[PDB]
């Protein structure tokens, strides 16, 4: 068995329909394809993204804003939403688990995420986010220290940093709970940001799959798996030509990114954490593939891309 | 030192607004007072309630409420609030304890708390939660079973159920962090209410101090400490003759709590959670004080209303 960082995604939470149930019934099938990793004796360390959720989420801390009700900042907002998908993800394995007559404990921990204040990402910020609001409200928010830019056409709306995590604050508790064979949820859409020893919490925004690459790092992990949208990274995506990509090194997928295979923003950070996860100590993996496509695990092996030296 | 479940509760968040800032300062003040029962040699696991946080994001549900993005229900928004509590208060904790140059890792374990669908609490609910609505609108909102008040001259709402926990869900993860010298926050808001096999959610609040009194019981604390707004609880409270309780036995507090001298929804609970703890098993304490009288503790001994039995 092997010791993996599973990172979801959207996929593990396809509902369309917004409302809680909906998106736990999504987990629980999502946990009905994690379980038969753990049926094949591996040892889950799990995390997920929030896109929707926060984004939600946000839009209800504007809709209430006022003195008595503020709006939380994004950084409690990431902790909101650590704490509702962890409640949902970690009930949905508590039954999938149950269903398949395994004991497995499973515990989902509030995790904050470090980023360096030097980063380049916040003399520039690129990430929006929140409403599109008016010039007025943005200029009111200009002079209140946020920074908006205005999407030509679309409004103006409020852009934050995207950092490199580079350290887990909870990473040790997280190691005493996986060494004692309990299934873990953290890393809760990229984290909540925090910067320095103080853990001063701002206003970012951090790549999930390099959250959970550093998570990986810090634990020792034997393999990161980010499950997303398709089976196969492909090169020739969407065309014709369409090629999955199945086992591949390290050189051979910057040959790809090279010739703009992999998409920025949604394949490319999972290209390059992984490729950085391979390259970070010896005998590593990364496989990037998607959750139906364990129903295809010869054993327990899993397939998709595969990612070695 | 011993093994303490430390149950905060309104005034450990003291803010003069609600802003996600001045709460956080406001449990900086809280974690320097703990910090203080960390340098004594205690081992504290700590819980929280969430009467106000939940409140208002119960209240942004409402504000934006539609298909697109439906209100949560009670449960999720409790989780939320162990998620926003629960980075609040870790990191208060860790700037509070780095200020005393101690070295100790923080903690927040979601916690789903389990009941009984038999609980008495289910037939007749007595806790006024969320938005005022108007009566057409609580009208239509009890078809399908809810219980809705009206509360004259202010509107109508929801009244769930206080039922009692029958067991903590990550009891033995808690308790394993707790094994390995982990400060664990736990149990925020009395926990996410689940019941049944599947730990389906339902909407209802656990009493926090009846959750945190179970806790103590499944980790084998040493003792309870329940910090709340008064140094001492009072017999004749408010009256000419009012005094304040010190050392008392169970018995003592029994004929008390049978003459009237505690009040219902604030301070009984805490009452009957100290009495129910130290007949729980021998060795076994509780104390009902405050943040601030912690700066009358004679050594590692904490002064208040302490139960023996
Ligand atoms: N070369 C590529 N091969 C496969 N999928 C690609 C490629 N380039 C872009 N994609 C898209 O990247 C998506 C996954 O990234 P993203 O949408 O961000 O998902 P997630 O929520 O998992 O982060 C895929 O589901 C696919 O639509
Ligand atoms: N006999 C009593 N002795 C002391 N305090 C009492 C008594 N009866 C009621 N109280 C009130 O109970 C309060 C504590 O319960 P509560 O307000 O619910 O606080 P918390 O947020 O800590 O749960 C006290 O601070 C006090 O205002
Ligand atoms: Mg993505
Ligand atoms: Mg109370």
């Given at each position: 068995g092997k010791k993996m960082v599973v990172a979801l995604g959207g996929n593990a939470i396809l509902s369309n329909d917004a409302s809680?149930?909906?998106?736990?019934?999504?987990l629980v099938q999502t946990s009905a394809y994690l379980v038969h990793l753990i049926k094949q004796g591996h040892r889950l360390i799990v995390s997920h993204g929030?896109?929707?959720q926060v984004g939600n989420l946000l839009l209800q801390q504007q809709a209430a804003d006022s003195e008595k009700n503020p709006?939380?900042?994004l950084d409690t907002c990431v902790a909101m939403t650590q704490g509702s998908i962890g409640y949902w993800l970690s009930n949905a394995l508590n039954q999938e688990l149950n269903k398949a007559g395994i004991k497995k404990q499973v515990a989902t921990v509030l995790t904050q995420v470090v980023v360096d204040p030097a980063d380049e990402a916040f003399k520039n910020p690129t990430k929006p986010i929140g409403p599109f609001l008016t010039e007025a409200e943005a200029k009111e928010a200009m002079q209140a220290g946020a920074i908006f830019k205005e999407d030509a056409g679309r409004g103006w709306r409020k852009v934050v940093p995207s950092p490199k995590p580079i350290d887990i604050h909870e990473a040790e508790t997280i190691n005493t709970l996986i060494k004692n064979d309990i299934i873990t949820i953290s890393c809760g859409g990229g984290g909540?940001?925090?910067?320095?020893?103080?853990?001063?919490?701002?206003?970012?925004?951090?790549?999930?799959?390099?959250?959970?690459?550093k998570l990986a790092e810090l634990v020792d992990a034997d393999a990161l798996v980010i499950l997303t949208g398709v089976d196969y990274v492909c090169i020739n995506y969407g065309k014709p030509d369409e090629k999955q990509l199945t086992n591949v090194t390290v050189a051979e997928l910057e040959e790809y990114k090279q010739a703009g295979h992999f998409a920025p923003g949604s394949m490319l950070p999972k290209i390059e954490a992984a490729?950085?996860?391979?390259?970070?100590?010896?005998?590593?993996?990364?496989?990037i593939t998607s959750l139906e496509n364990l129903g295809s695990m010869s054993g327990d092996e899993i397939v998709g891309?595969?990612?070695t030296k």
């Open positions: 809680a149930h909906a998106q736990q019934q999504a929030n896109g929707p709006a939380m900042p909540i940001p925090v910067v320095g020893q103080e853990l001063k919490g701002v206003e970012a925004v951090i790549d999930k799959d390099f959250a959970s690459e490729i950085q996860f391979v390259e970070s100590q010896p005998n590593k993996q990364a496989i891309t595969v990612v």
